[PDB]
Ligand binder design. Structure first.
Ligand SMILES: CCCCCCCC/C=C\CCCCCCCC(=O)O[C@@H](COC(=O)CCCCCCCCCCCCCCC)COP(=O)([O-])OCC[N+](C)(C)C
Lengths: 51, 14
């Protein structure tokens, strides 16, 4: 753990939980991530996210 | 029409 300062090991882990929460919110806010996981048969209101 | 589907994606359950 020596090649990075203990300021940096906390700032990576705080950004690891930070970007994870932003990418979850920004995928639900976006309409393009909503689609069907069943492309074989046609639509039966099966629009579903993955995140 | 944006206020229709903004609650569809703030569905809060799934
Ligand atoms: C290249 C990869 C980069 C990306 C990865 C970065 C991830 C963040 C990683 C680390 C972030 C925080 C680490 C800083 C702690 C150092 C303080 C310390 O030395 O005390 C203690 C060690 O400290 C420990 O707790 C060792 C375990 C830390 C790494 C493993 C964390 C989880 C595994 C990963 C799970 C997934 C991680 C994500 C999910 C959360 C004891 O040390 P000491 O007894 O005092 O003797 C040493 C003395 N000296 C050091 C002063 C010489």
């Amino acid at each position: 753990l020596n090649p990075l300062s203990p300021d940096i090991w906390m700032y990576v882990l705080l950004a690891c939980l930070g970007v994870s929460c932003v990418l979850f919110v920004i995928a639900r806010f976006s309409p393009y991530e909503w689609y069907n996981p069943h492309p074989c048969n046609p639509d039966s209101d099966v629009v579903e996210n993955n995140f | 029409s944006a206020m229709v589907e903004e609650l569809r994606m703030s569905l809060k359950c799934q």
